[PDB]
Short mmCIF file of C-alpha atoms in Angstrom, two decimals:
data_model
loop_
_atom_site.label_atom_id
_atom_site.label_comp_id
_atom_site.label_asym_id
_atom_site.label_seq_id
_atom_site.Cartn_x
_atom_site.Cartn_y
_atom_site.Cartn_z
CA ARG V 1 232.70 28.15 46.84
CA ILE V 2 235.64 29.80 49.27
CA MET V 3 238.77 28.34 47.04
CA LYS V 4 236.72 28.84 43.52
CA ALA V 5 237.50 32.86 44.67
CA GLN V 6 240.53 32.92 46.31
CA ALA V 7 242.86 36.22 43.95
CA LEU V 8 245.95 33.80 44.65
CA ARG V 9 244.44 30.29 43.65
CA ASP V 10 246.53 27.82 42.57
CA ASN V 11 244.00 26.57 40.59
CA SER V 12 245.45 22.95 39.58
CA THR V 13 246.24 21.89 42.43
CA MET V 14 242.32 21.95 44.08
CA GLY V 15 241.42 21.05 40.29
CA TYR V 16 241.88 18.27 41.69
CA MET V 17 241.11 18.83 45.77
CA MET V 18 238.02 19.35 44.42
CA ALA V 19 235.36 16.09 46.35
CA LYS V 20 232.65 14.91 44.88
CA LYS V 21 228.67 14.13 45.68
CA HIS V 22 226.13 11.49 46.45
CA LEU V 23 222.50 12.37 45.45
CA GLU V 24 219.96 11.47 48.65
CA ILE V 25 215.99 10.94 47.63
CA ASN V 26 213.63 11.23 49.44
CA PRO V 27 211.29 7.65 49.35
CA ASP V 28 208.09 9.02 50.69
CA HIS V 29 208.44 12.14 48.09
CA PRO V 30 205.19 12.36 45.75
CA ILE V 31 208.32 12.73 42.62
CA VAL V 32 210.00 10.16 43.49
CA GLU V 33 206.91 8.02 43.42
CA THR V 34 205.89 8.70 40.90
CA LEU V 35 209.20 8.88 38.49
CA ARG V 36 209.63 4.99 39.43
CA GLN V 37 206.13 4.31 38.43
CA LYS V 38 207.61 5.80 35.17
CA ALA V 39 210.05 4.43 35.54
CA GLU V 40 209.33 0.78 35.94
CA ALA V 41 206.12 2.05 33.04
CA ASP V 42 209.33 2.18 31.19
CA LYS V 43 212.36 1.68 32.20
CA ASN V 44 213.60 3.48 29.37
CA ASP V 45 211.80 6.36 28.64
CA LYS V 46 213.12 10.18 27.29
CA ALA V 47 210.87 11.68 29.65
CA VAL V 48 212.26 9.61 33.29
CA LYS V 49 215.96 10.92 31.19
CA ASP V 50 214.44 14.05 31.18
CA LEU V 51 213.36 14.46 34.63
CA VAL V 52 216.63 12.82 36.06
CA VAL V 53 218.58 15.68 34.44
CA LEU V 54 215.58 18.14 35.86
CA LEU V 55 215.66 17.70 39.08
CA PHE V 56 219.37 16.53 39.73
CA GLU V 57 220.42 20.58 38.78
CA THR V 58 217.41 21.98 40.49
CA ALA V 59 219.76 19.93 44.18
CA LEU V 60 222.80 21.17 43.06
CA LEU V 61 221.26 24.98 44.08
CA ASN Z 1 248.12 -4.70 48.95
CA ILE Z 2 249.53 -0.69 48.66
CA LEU Z 3 245.80 0.71 48.14
CA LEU Z 4 244.39 2.10 50.77
CA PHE Z 5 244.42 5.36 53.44
CA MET Z 6 244.31 8.18 50.22
CA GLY Z 7 243.52 10.69 52.70
CA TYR Z 8 245.95 13.79 52.01
CA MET Z 9 244.93 17.05 54.80
CA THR Z 10 246.90 19.44 52.37
CA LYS Z 11 247.67 22.96 54.10
CA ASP Z 12 245.10 26.45 52.75
CA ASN Z 13 245.67 30.13 52.21
CA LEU Z 14 244.38 33.08 54.58
CA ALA Z 15 247.10 35.95 52.66
CA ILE Z 16 244.41 38.89 50.65
CA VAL Z 17 244.86 41.16 47.85
CA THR Z 18 242.15 43.70 49.22
CA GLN Z 19 240.43 45.56 47.15
CA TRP Z 20 240.25 49.75 47.61
CA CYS Z 21 237.29 51.23 46.80
CA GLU Z 22 237.22 53.39 43.78
CA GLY Z 23 236.76 57.19 45.19
CA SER Z 24 234.12 59.01 44.78
CA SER Z 25 235.47 63.49 43.21
CA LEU Z 26 233.14 65.63 45.41
CA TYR Z 27 231.57 66.03 42.03
CA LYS Z 28 230.05 63.02 41.43
CA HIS Z 29 229.11 62.99 45.62
CA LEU Z 30 227.35 65.93 45.35
CA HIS Z 31 225.81 67.02 42.68
CA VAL Z 32 227.14 63.99 40.16
CA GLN Z 33 224.99 62.33 42.44
CA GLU Z 34 223.99 63.75 46.10
CA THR Z 35 225.55 60.84 48.56
CA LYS Z 36 224.54 61.84 51.51
CA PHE Z 37 226.73 61.78 55.25
CA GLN Z 38 226.17 64.08 58.62
CA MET Z 39 227.95 66.65 58.85
CA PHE Z 40 231.31 66.29 61.36
CA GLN Z 41 231.57 63.99 58.30
CA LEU Z 42 231.80 66.77 56.05
CA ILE Z 43 234.00 68.87 58.85
CA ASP Z 44 236.54 65.51 59.21
CA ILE Z 45 237.03 65.45 55.53
CA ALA Z 46 238.05 68.69 56.03
CA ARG Z 47 240.39 68.02 58.46
CA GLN Z 48 241.54 64.91 56.56
CA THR Z 49 242.80 67.10 53.28
CA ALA Z 50 244.31 69.99 55.29
CA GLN Z 51 246.86 66.62 56.99
CA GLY Z 52 246.76 66.30 53.93
CA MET Z 53 247.63 68.95 52.19
CA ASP Z 54 249.91 70.39 55.12
CA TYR Z 55 252.10 67.79 55.28
CA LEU Z 56 251.88 68.07 51.32
CA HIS Z 57 252.95 71.91 51.56
CA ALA Z 58 255.93 71.32 53.56
CA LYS Z 59 258.28 69.77 50.51
CA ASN Z 60 257.46 72.74 48.42
CA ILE Z 61 255.24 70.73 46.36
CA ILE Z 62 252.76 73.12 44.04
CA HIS Z 63 249.88 72.19 42.15
CA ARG Z 64 247.70 74.33 40.32
CA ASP Z 65 244.01 74.12 40.64
CA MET Z 66 243.22 72.35 43.69
CA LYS Z 67 239.99 71.23 43.08
CA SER Z 68 237.04 69.29 44.46
CA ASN Z 69 237.16 66.65 41.56
CA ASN Z 70 241.19 65.72 42.24
CA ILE Z 71 240.04 64.43 46.00
CA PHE Z 72 238.49 60.99 45.99
CA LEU Z 73 236.77 59.76 48.61
CA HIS Z 74 236.76 55.80 50.16
CA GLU Z 75 235.18 53.69 51.83
CA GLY Z 76 234.91 53.74 55.73
CA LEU Z 77 235.88 58.55 56.45
CA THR Z 78 238.33 57.54 54.24
CA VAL Z 79 238.97 61.41 51.60
CA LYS Z 80 241.91 61.77 49.93
CA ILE Z 81 243.90 63.56 47.53
CA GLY Z 82 244.84 62.46 43.85
CA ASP Z 83 245.38 63.95 40.61
CA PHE Z 84 243.06 62.45 37.54
CA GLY Z 85 240.37 65.42 37.89
CA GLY Z 86 235.09 74.72 28.07
CA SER Z 87 236.00 72.72 31.85
CA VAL Z 88 235.62 73.12 35.44
CA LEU Z 89 238.34 75.55 36.19
CA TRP Z 90 238.90 77.15 40.11
CA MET Z 91 242.25 80.30 39.95
CA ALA Z 92 243.36 82.93 41.55
CA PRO Z 93 243.36 85.53 39.35
CA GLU Z 94 246.86 85.08 39.66
CA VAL Z 95 247.63 82.76 37.67
CA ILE Z 96 243.94 84.14 35.18
CA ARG Z 97 246.80 86.70 34.27
CA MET Z 98 249.28 86.76 32.09
CA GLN Z 99 251.55 88.43 34.01
CA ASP Z 100 253.64 86.07 36.34
CA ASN Z 101 253.83 82.54 34.52
CA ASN Z 102 255.25 80.10 37.04
CA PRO Z 103 252.14 81.69 39.69
CA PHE Z 104 253.65 78.33 41.56
CA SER Z 105 253.50 81.04 45.18
CA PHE Z 106 251.52 78.38 48.05
CA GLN Z 107 248.62 80.39 48.65
CA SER Z 108 247.14 79.86 45.48
CA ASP Z 109 246.77 76.18 46.16
CA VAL Z 110 245.18 77.35 49.44
CA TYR Z 111 242.83 79.68 48.51
CA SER Z 112 241.41 76.61 46.14
CA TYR Z 113 241.55 75.04 49.18
CA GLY Z 114 239.20 77.83 50.21
CA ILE Z 115 237.01 77.54 47.11
CA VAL Z 116 237.01 73.05 48.52
CA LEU Z 117 236.07 73.93 50.98
CA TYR Z 118 232.87 75.91 49.93
CA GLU Z 119 232.07 73.04 48.00
CA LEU Z 120 232.21 70.90 51.07
CA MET Z 121 230.03 74.20 52.58
CA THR Z 122 227.36 74.39 49.84
CA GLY Z 123 227.27 71.14 47.80
CA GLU Z 124 226.59 73.47 44.56
CA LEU Z 125 228.86 74.59 42.22
CA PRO Z 126 230.14 78.48 43.47
CA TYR Z 127 228.55 80.69 40.73
CA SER Z 128 226.00 78.01 39.71
CA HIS Z 129 222.83 79.87 38.94
CA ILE Z 130 225.16 84.09 39.30
CA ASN Z 131 227.65 83.53 36.06
CA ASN Z 132 228.53 82.62 32.28
CA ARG Z 133 231.98 82.62 31.67
CA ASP Z 134 231.91 86.02 30.37
CA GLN Z 135 230.87 87.55 32.80
CA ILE Z 136 232.86 84.59 35.54
CA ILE Z 137 235.65 84.76 34.07
CA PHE Z 138 236.60 88.63 33.94
CA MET Z 139 235.11 89.79 37.90
CA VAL Z 140 236.94 87.13 38.90
CA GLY Z 141 240.63 87.46 37.42
CA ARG Z 142 239.74 91.96 37.98
CA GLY Z 143 239.45 90.95 41.49
CA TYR Z 144 235.80 92.27 41.61
CA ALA Z 145 233.85 88.96 42.58
CA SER Z 146 232.59 86.02 45.53
CA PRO Z 147 230.16 82.98 44.45
CA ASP Z 148 226.89 84.03 46.96
CA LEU Z 149 226.99 82.51 51.28
CA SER Z 150 223.10 81.78 50.56
CA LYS Z 151 224.60 78.11 49.82
CA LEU Z 152 227.19 77.99 52.39
CA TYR Z 153 224.64 75.84 54.70
CA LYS Z 154 223.08 77.12 58.55
CA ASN Z 155 224.19 73.83 60.11
CA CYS Z 156 227.19 74.54 60.42
CA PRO Z 157 227.46 76.18 62.58
CA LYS Z 158 229.26 79.63 63.88
CA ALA Z 159 233.20 78.54 64.38
CA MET Z 160 233.55 76.97 60.84
CA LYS Z 161 231.06 78.96 59.24
CA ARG Z 162 233.09 82.31 60.79
CA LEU Z 163 236.63 80.57 59.30
CA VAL Z 164 235.08 79.53 55.73
CA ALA Z 165 233.86 83.58 55.54
CA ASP Z 166 237.72 84.02 55.88
CA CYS Z 167 238.25 81.25 53.20
CA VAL Z 168 236.13 83.98 51.20
CA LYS Z 169 238.38 86.82 52.42
CA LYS Z 170 241.98 85.18 51.74
CA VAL Z 171 241.44 86.22 47.99
CA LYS Z 172 242.58 90.27 49.29
CA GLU Z 173 245.84 88.41 51.79
CA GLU Z 174 249.17 86.81 51.08
CA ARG Z 175 248.71 83.69 53.75
CA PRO Z 176 250.38 80.37 53.72
CA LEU Z 177 248.18 79.62 57.43
CA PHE Z 178 247.66 75.42 56.49
CA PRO Z 179 249.57 74.44 59.87
CA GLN Z 180 247.59 77.06 61.75
CA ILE Z 181 244.66 76.57 59.33
CA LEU Z 182 244.48 72.91 60.37
CA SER Z 183 245.12 74.18 64.08
CA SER Z 184 242.07 76.08 63.91
CA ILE Z 185 239.36 73.15 61.97
CA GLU Z 186 241.04 70.39 64.58
CA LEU Z 187 240.62 72.65 68.00
CA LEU Z 188 237.10 74.12 66.56
CA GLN Z 189 235.95 70.01 66.41
CA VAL I 1 286.21 55.34 56.17
CA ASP I 2 284.06 58.33 55.73
CA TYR I 3 280.34 57.09 54.02
CA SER I 4 279.79 61.05 53.47
CA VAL I 5 279.27 60.86 50.08
CA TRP I 6 276.82 59.35 50.28
CA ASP I 7 274.94 61.40 53.03
CA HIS I 8 271.44 62.87 50.26
CA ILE I 9 270.07 61.18 47.60
CA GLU I 10 266.03 61.99 46.30
CA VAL I 11 263.78 58.26 44.42
CA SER I 12 260.22 59.21 43.29
CA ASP I 13 258.56 55.85 43.69
CA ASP I 14 259.34 55.13 47.78
CA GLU I 15 256.73 53.90 49.61
CA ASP I 16 258.37 54.95 52.59
CA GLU I 17 257.98 58.50 52.96
CA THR I 18 253.56 58.34 51.47
CA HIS I 19 251.03 60.97 53.28
CA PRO I 20 247.89 58.47 55.04
CA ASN I 21 246.07 60.87 53.67
CA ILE I 22 246.51 61.47 50.00
CA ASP I 23 246.66 59.49 47.37
CA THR I 24 250.15 57.25 46.96
CA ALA I 25 250.25 56.51 43.37
CA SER I 26 248.93 59.61 42.74
CA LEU I 27 252.25 61.49 44.80
CA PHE I 28 254.75 58.78 42.94
CA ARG I 29 254.25 60.34 40.05
CA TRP I 30 253.23 64.10 41.17
CA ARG I 31 256.92 63.71 43.05
CA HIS I 32 258.94 62.80 39.72
CA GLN I 33 257.65 65.27 38.25
CA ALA I 34 258.77 67.82 40.48
CA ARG I 35 262.40 66.62 40.04
CA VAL I 36 263.07 66.93 36.63
CA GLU I 37 261.09 69.98 36.08
CA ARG I 38 264.28 71.39 38.51
CA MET I 39 266.52 69.45 36.44
CA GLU I 40 265.74 71.11 33.34
CA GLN I 41 265.51 74.59 34.45
CA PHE I 42 269.28 74.17 36.02
CA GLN I 43 270.14 73.18 32.05
CA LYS I 44 268.86 76.28 31.09
CA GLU I 45 271.35 77.80 33.93
CA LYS I 46 273.90 76.22 32.32
CA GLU I 47 272.99 77.28 28.67
CA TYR T 1 243.78 54.70 81.49
CA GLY T 2 241.38 56.01 79.80
CA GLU T 3 242.54 59.59 78.65
CA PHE T 4 246.17 57.89 78.15
CA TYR T 5 244.92 55.68 75.11
CA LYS T 6 243.60 58.45 73.04
CA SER T 7 246.97 60.36 73.36
CA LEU T 8 248.57 56.32 72.96
CA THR T 9 246.65 55.76 69.67
CA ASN T 10 244.76 58.71 68.68
CA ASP T 11 241.54 57.74 69.06
CA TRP T 12 238.05 59.84 70.19
CA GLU T 13 236.54 57.22 72.21
CA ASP T 14 237.30 55.61 75.07
CA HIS T 15 239.69 52.09 75.70
CA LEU T 16 236.48 48.95 75.75
CA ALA T 17 238.85 47.37 77.88
CA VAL T 18 242.50 47.49 79.92
CA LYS T 19 244.92 45.13 81.05
CA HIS T 20 247.48 46.01 83.07
CA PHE T 21 250.50 43.51 85.21
CA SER T 22 254.43 42.72 86.43
CA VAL T 23 255.81 40.03 85.55
CA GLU T 24 259.00 39.27 88.82
CA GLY T 25 262.63 38.05 87.80
CA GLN T 26 265.08 38.14 85.54
CA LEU T 27 262.30 40.33 83.73
CA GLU T 28 260.86 43.10 85.19
CA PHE T 29 258.35 43.79 82.41
CA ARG T 30 255.74 45.69 82.91
CA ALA T 31 252.95 46.70 80.05
CA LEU T 32 249.67 48.10 79.84
CA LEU T 33 247.44 46.33 77.03
CA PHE T 34 244.15 48.14 75.89
CA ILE T 35 241.71 46.67 73.14
CA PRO T 36 239.80 49.33 70.76
CA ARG T 37 235.88 49.38 70.49
CA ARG T 38 235.74 49.20 66.92
CA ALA T 39 238.66 47.41 64.72
CA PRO T 40 240.64 49.63 62.72
CA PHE T 41 239.79 50.71 59.03
CA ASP T 42 242.73 48.53 57.85
CA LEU T 43 243.24 45.79 60.46
CA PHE T 44 244.31 43.34 58.02
CA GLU T 45 245.17 45.23 54.56
CA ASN T 46 248.35 46.59 55.98
CA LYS T 47 252.08 45.58 54.33
CA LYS T 48 253.18 44.13 57.89
CA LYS T 49 251.76 44.46 61.35
CA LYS T 50 251.11 48.34 61.85
CA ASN T 51 253.06 49.74 65.85
CA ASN T 52 250.16 47.93 67.94
CA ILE T 53 253.09 47.17 70.67
CA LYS T 54 255.80 49.66 71.55
CA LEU T 55 259.02 48.77 73.21
CA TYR T 56 260.62 50.17 75.81
CA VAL T 57 263.33 49.94 78.27
CA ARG T 58 264.15 52.74 81.20
CA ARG T 59 260.98 54.34 79.72
CA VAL T 60 262.74 55.24 75.86
CA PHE T 61 261.48 53.77 72.97
CA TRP L 1 264.65 -7.01 48.93
CA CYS L 2 261.68 -7.32 51.19
CA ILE L 3 261.03 -10.58 48.56
CA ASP L 4 264.41 -11.63 48.42
CA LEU L 5 264.87 -14.42 52.03
CA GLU L 6 260.93 -14.06 53.45
CA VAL L 7 261.16 -17.86 54.35
CA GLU L 8 264.58 -17.31 57.19
CA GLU L 9 265.52 -12.58 57.37
CA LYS L 10 265.68 -11.53 59.78
CA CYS L 11 263.13 -8.60 62.01
CA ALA L 12 265.35 -5.46 62.10
CA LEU L 13 266.59 -5.31 58.28
CA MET L 14 262.37 -5.53 56.98
CA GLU L 15 261.81 -3.41 60.11
CA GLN L 16 263.39 -0.99 57.64
CA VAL L 17 261.50 -1.85 54.31
CA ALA L 18 258.48 -1.45 56.37
CA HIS L 19 259.10 2.05 57.38
CA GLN L 20 261.12 2.66 53.56
CA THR L 21 258.87 1.44 51.21
CA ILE L 22 255.92 2.41 53.24
CA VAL L 23 257.07 7.06 52.71
CA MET L 24 258.24 6.44 50.00
CA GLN L 25 255.33 4.35 48.31
CA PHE L 26 252.87 6.76 50.08
CA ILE L 27 254.86 9.92 47.96
CA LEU L 28 254.71 7.99 45.05
CA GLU L 29 250.76 7.98 45.30
CA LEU L 30 251.06 11.10 46.21
CA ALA L 31 252.49 12.39 43.34
CA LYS L 32 250.32 10.24 40.62
CA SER L 33 247.42 11.90 42.54
CA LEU L 34 249.18 15.85 41.97
CA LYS L 35 252.01 16.49 39.86
CA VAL L 36 254.94 16.83 41.65
CA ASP L 37 258.69 14.96 41.77
CA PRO L 38 259.10 13.52 45.25
CA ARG L 39 261.82 15.65 45.75
CA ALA L 40 259.57 19.28 45.69
CA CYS L 41 256.87 17.34 47.50
CA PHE L 42 259.67 17.26 50.73
CA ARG L 43 258.78 15.18 54.01
CA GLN L 44 258.96 18.80 55.87
CA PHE L 45 255.03 16.84 56.27
CA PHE L 46 256.33 13.81 58.11
CA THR L 47 256.02 16.58 61.26
CA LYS L 48 252.80 15.43 61.51
CA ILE L 49 251.67 13.49 65.36
CA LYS L 50 248.52 11.94 62.97
CA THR L 51 247.07 8.68 63.91
CA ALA L 52 247.11 7.81 59.92
CA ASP L 53 250.91 7.34 60.46
CA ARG L 54 250.40 5.06 63.45
CA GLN L 55 248.02 2.61 63.21
CA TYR L 56 247.77 2.68 59.36
CA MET L 57 251.95 1.46 59.25
CA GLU L 58 251.53 -1.13 61.79
CA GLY L 59 248.27 -2.45 59.89
CA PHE L 60 249.35 -2.25 56.49
CA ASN L 61 253.37 -3.61 57.44
CA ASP L 62 250.79 -7.11 58.63
CA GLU L 63 249.28 -7.49 55.22
CA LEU L 64 252.83 -7.26 53.28
CA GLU L 65 254.97 -9.47 55.45
CA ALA L 66 251.50 -11.92 55.90
CA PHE L 67 250.39 -11.81 52.27
CA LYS L 68 253.88 -13.47 50.35
CA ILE O 1 237.68 46.28 23.94
CA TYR O 2 234.26 44.47 24.55
CA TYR O 3 235.45 41.74 27.82
CA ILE O 4 233.73 39.85 29.81
CA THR O 5 234.59 37.65 33.59
CA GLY O 6 232.90 34.41 34.58
CA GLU O 7 233.80 31.22 35.46
CA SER O 8 234.86 29.82 32.85
CA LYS O 9 236.06 29.50 29.42
CA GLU O 10 232.75 28.03 28.38
CA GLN O 11 230.69 29.36 30.78
CA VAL O 12 230.90 32.95 29.97
CA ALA O 13 231.02 31.86 25.03
CA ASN O 14 227.94 30.77 26.11
CA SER O 15 226.74 33.67 28.25
CA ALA O 16 223.66 35.90 27.31
CA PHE O 17 225.24 39.34 26.75
CA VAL O 18 227.08 37.84 24.38
CA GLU O 19 225.16 37.03 21.60
CA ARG O 20 225.20 40.35 19.63
CA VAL O 21 228.74 41.83 19.90
CA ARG O 22 229.25 37.60 18.45
CA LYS O 23 226.25 38.34 15.19
CA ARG O 24 227.54 41.44 14.37
CA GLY O 25 230.72 39.77 14.22
CA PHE O 26 233.35 41.98 17.55
CA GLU O 27 235.46 39.72 19.61
CA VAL O 28 235.18 39.73 22.95
CA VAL O 29 237.65 38.76 25.71
CA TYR O 30 237.21 36.34 28.13
CA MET O 31 238.24 37.06 31.49
CA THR O 32 237.78 33.37 33.36
CA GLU O 33 239.84 34.52 37.04
CA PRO O 34 239.67 36.26 40.38
CA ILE O 35 241.86 38.39 40.11
CA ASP O 36 241.07 40.01 36.89
CA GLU O 37 238.58 41.81 38.54
CA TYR O 38 241.51 43.76 40.20
CA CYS O 39 243.93 44.60 37.35
CA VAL O 40 240.56 45.24 35.16
CA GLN O 41 239.57 47.90 38.27
CA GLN O 42 243.27 49.30 37.05
CA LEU O 43 242.96 48.50 33.59
CA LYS O 44 241.36 51.63 32.26
CA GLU O 45 242.68 51.63 28.64
CA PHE O 46 245.11 50.52 26.42
CA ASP O 47 246.31 51.38 23.62
CA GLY O 48 244.34 54.96 23.74
CA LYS O 49 241.98 52.71 23.56
CA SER O 50 239.05 52.36 26.14
CA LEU O 51 238.07 48.65 28.09
CA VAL O 52 233.68 48.20 28.40
CA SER O 53 232.10 45.16 30.12
CA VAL O 54 229.31 43.91 28.51
CA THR O 55 227.97 42.70 31.27
CA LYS O 56 227.15 46.24 32.28
CA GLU O 57 224.51 49.11 31.72
CA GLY O 58 224.60 51.41 28.64
CA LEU O 59 226.43 49.10 26.38
CA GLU O 60 227.03 50.93 22.88
CA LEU O 61 227.84 49.22 19.78
CA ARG P 1 231.12 37.27 44.18
CA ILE P 2 234.54 37.03 45.05
CA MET P 3 233.90 40.01 47.51
CA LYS P 4 230.82 38.73 49.91
CA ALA P 5 233.54 35.11 49.88
CA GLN P 6 236.07 36.97 50.82
CA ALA P 7 237.90 35.68 54.91
CA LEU P 8 238.73 38.74 56.26
CA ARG P 9 237.43 41.75 54.87
CA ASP P 10 234.60 43.79 55.75
CA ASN P 11 232.20 43.22 53.82
CA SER P 12 229.49 45.88 56.28
CA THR P 13 230.78 49.18 54.33
CA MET P 14 229.61 47.08 50.35
CA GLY P 15 227.09 50.00 50.51
CA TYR P 16 228.51 52.53 48.06
CA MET P 17 230.36 49.99 46.20
CA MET P 18 227.67 47.78 45.17
CA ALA P 19 226.10 48.21 42.03
CA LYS P 20 222.44 48.03 40.48
CA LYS P 21 220.47 45.75 38.64
CA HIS P 22 219.24 47.14 36.01
CA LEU P 23 217.10 44.49 33.84
CA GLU P 24 216.40 44.65 30.29
CA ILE P 25 213.97 42.78 27.71
CA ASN P 26 213.95 40.41 24.83
CA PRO P 27 211.44 42.84 22.84
CA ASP P 28 210.90 39.91 19.69
CA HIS P 29 211.65 37.43 22.02
CA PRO P 30 207.88 35.18 21.90
CA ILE P 31 207.57 34.84 25.14
CA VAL P 32 208.12 38.55 25.63
CA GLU P 33 205.79 39.45 22.99
CA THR P 34 203.70 37.43 24.89
CA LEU P 35 204.10 39.07 28.03
CA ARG P 36 202.85 41.98 27.24
CA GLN P 37 199.08 40.03 25.67
CA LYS P 38 198.92 38.40 29.67
CA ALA P 39 199.65 42.50 31.20
CA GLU P 40 197.78 44.03 28.19
CA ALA P 41 194.69 42.79 29.30
CA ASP P 42 195.14 43.01 32.96
CA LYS P 43 197.49 44.39 34.74
CA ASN P 44 197.02 43.92 37.97
CA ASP P 45 196.81 40.38 37.41
CA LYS P 46 198.39 38.57 39.54
CA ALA P 47 199.58 35.46 37.12
CA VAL P 48 201.58 38.05 35.24
CA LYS P 49 203.03 39.62 38.42
CA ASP P 50 204.60 36.16 39.05
CA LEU P 51 206.20 35.58 35.76
CA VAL P 52 207.70 38.30 36.52
CA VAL P 53 208.80 36.96 40.02
CA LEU P 54 210.24 33.79 38.12
CA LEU P 55 211.62 34.78 35.68
CA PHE P 56 213.73 37.27 37.37
CA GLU P 57 215.00 35.02 39.58
CA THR P 58 216.20 32.50 36.51
CA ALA P 59 217.49 35.85 34.36
CA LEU P 60 219.81 36.33 37.85
CA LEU P 61 220.84 32.67 38.63
#
């Protein structure tokens, strides 16, 4: 956040330096429990694909 | 073989091009919005602009029509003179007349300071209820008019309200008092 | 070694003589104006 | 000290704290170091560090 | 050159290959990792006291000597 | 001159303020750097034409 | 966003430079048309109160 807000960014170098994300899931949670039961009933379900992104975005925020 | 130990621990920057507050005109601050500060701050911005005018006049530098707008009020206790600024003019009658084409003498700006000091004290235009354009032009140019003391605030103590009343009396006068005005307001704080 | 030719120079757009109670950017354009008007009245005096 | 700070600094307020000391040896300096009560408006905005410690020799600046 | 006489070579001259290659190869990895020229990015960074020079240098000295 | 400022070109190009001025065939300038705020504070007009922010109240089209 | 993120600026005095948020609604768009039908039956209904915070949050974001 702070580096992106600087006036004199030197933006190319920071565009390399920004470090990557790891997602963590709570095994006990009704959402993860449900999403797993849904994904086990059909691995290729378009509803679980649409879910995983909606869920993911919320965790960015 | 060559792969590991990637992390490179580079330098970080703390140099800031600090934003400057777009200052309010006193019109913006007083009428056009009615943003409120305690009266000691109002006397402080009078002192601050009186120092600016004092430092200015020492260099024979005259801008005609010194006003409450061409001054800017910024973040902190911070008030500072500018140039951006029919239209709302304030004038000594010598400037109004055709008579002398360079009415350049410092006394005009001192009396125009006295007008903006009464704006600071009234928070509303001088002559705001009294006149339309014909009367406010003619009677002032003829030397035959004064703004009312009714709008001048009675939360001011005797020291500064009397000094402001002398800033009305200066219309009758030729006195370039600025360093002594500055002394007077400063000491009365 | 006389340097008296250099004694007095006028510079508008000088940051070393800005008053703290005045908008600095206003003062430069305003101080430049005085220089040019002084010069034009002196050119008129030559006419 | 309290009225000296106001004289040196043009402040209204009394100092927050003082140090006063003398260094012996070949360098014989004396110094006052005052902390202001409230940080000055332009503490970082200035082009260069604005005159905070003044150096004197035999009481001339 | 550290490959040239691996069967027989004397420790000092190969320990100087360790030094040259670790410093230059780190730079070349940064030059792939950034836009920079290896003359423009520069050995001002070699002042650093950090454990990443000391521990990792000897770890790779052993790896690169032993394998060939 | 109509302009908008924000975190990237595509984030600005998709932003909800921009649809009417696109539909009406106007040109929007994209200002995607932190330093743009500081120059736009001072560049109030160009060639006698004022600069108007697409993200402010009272927007006239 | 940028002023909040500065390392060495005192934002406490922001009060005079912070702008105030004016909310604008699309009169044509189905959700706002439906919301006038929902608000019509009960002006005090919490279910329409709950939208006008959720929509505000979604619009802020």
